Design a protein around this ligand. Structure first.
Ligand code: HEM
Ligand code: K
Length: 249
């Protein structure tokens, strides 16, 4: 149920221009995982019942960056500011979601559809809406389902975003990559999850919760066996995530 706003031709030209420059910049800086995290932490604050939070540019606000869940994302915001300044017509809201789509693409993942038109909103949401890594399946459904309004399939697919990147003990406190190829967007997150803990590789309690939940576990198996199926479900979930509260909820 999305009705995307009309934006001017000049706006659409800037989107296409910005998309290309974001590819070059993110590939050069090797920061795709961090940019995906910035996009996801921007959007993941949406609460469907109140229609507050969501991907509306507030994460660049120092009050939102200071949330402990966002440790390390001020680096991301800073990295992007010079490029953003070359595209003054774009909202920060659109710019950060576009960076997220590009981060998935340049690491070899699916092409997530992107629609412009998000407005930058004045007030960041309250802290505490993003998921706690030490909790489990009920928690995940509270946050992805009851707050953001996403499905159980969306939760497992989006968890696969950890196929790129790593944790840092000075940011979350957790440390290391989930995969042997953490700048490559593939289904490796799920195959590692299934195989046991391997030395050097990370699994959060929130990752392991997927293995024991009766709805989540069949999806983990699907994705581990069929990367195309993962890509399809990932692309659907990321688009929905990136559009929470936008063009209708
Ligand atoms: C399912 C609930 C989730 C939890 C509990 C969670 C938790 C975490 C934690 C604790 C970190 C480590 C931060 C650090 O120390 O640097 C992290 C990193 C990361 N997260 Fe998630 N996350 C979740 C979902 C997501 C989703 C939905 C996405 C995007 C689709 C995502 C993408 C990433 C990425 C790409 C990193 C790596 C960042 C980097 O390499 O610097 N995560 N997550
Ligand atoms: K990977």
């Amino acid at each position: 149920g999305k009705s995307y706003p009309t934006v001017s031709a000049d706006y659409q030209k800037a989107v296409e221009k910005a998309k290309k420059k974001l590819r070059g910049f993110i590939a050069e800086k090797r920061c795709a995982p961090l940019m995906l995290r910035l996009a996801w932490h921007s959007a993941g604050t949406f609460d469907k019942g109140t229609k507050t939070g969501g991907p509306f540019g507030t994460i660049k606000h120092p009050a939102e960056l200071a949330h402990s869940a966002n440790n390390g994302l001020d680096i991301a915001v800073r990295l992007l500011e010079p490029l953003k300044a070359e595209f003054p017509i774009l909202s920060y809201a659109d710019f950060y979601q576009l960076a997220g789509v590009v981060a998935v693409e340049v690491t070899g993942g699916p092409e997530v559809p992107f629609h412009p038109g998000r407005e930058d909103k004045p007030e960041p949401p309250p802290e505490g809406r993003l998921p706690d890594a030490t909790k489990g399946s009920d928690h995940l459904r509270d946050v992805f389902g009851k707050a953001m309004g996403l499905t159980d399939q969306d939760i497992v697919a989006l968890s696969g975003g950890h196929t790129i990147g790593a944790a840092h003990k000075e940011r979350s406190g957790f440390e290391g990559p989930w995969t042997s190829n953490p700048l490559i967007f593939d289904n490796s997150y799920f195959t590692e999850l299934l195989s046991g803990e391997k030395e050097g590789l990370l699994q959060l309690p929130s990752d392991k919760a997927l293995l024991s939940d009766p709805v989540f576990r069949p999806l983990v198996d699907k994705y581990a066996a069929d990367e195309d199926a993962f890509f399809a479900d990932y692309a659907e979930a990321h688009q929905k995530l990136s559009e929470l509260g936008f063009a209708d909820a």
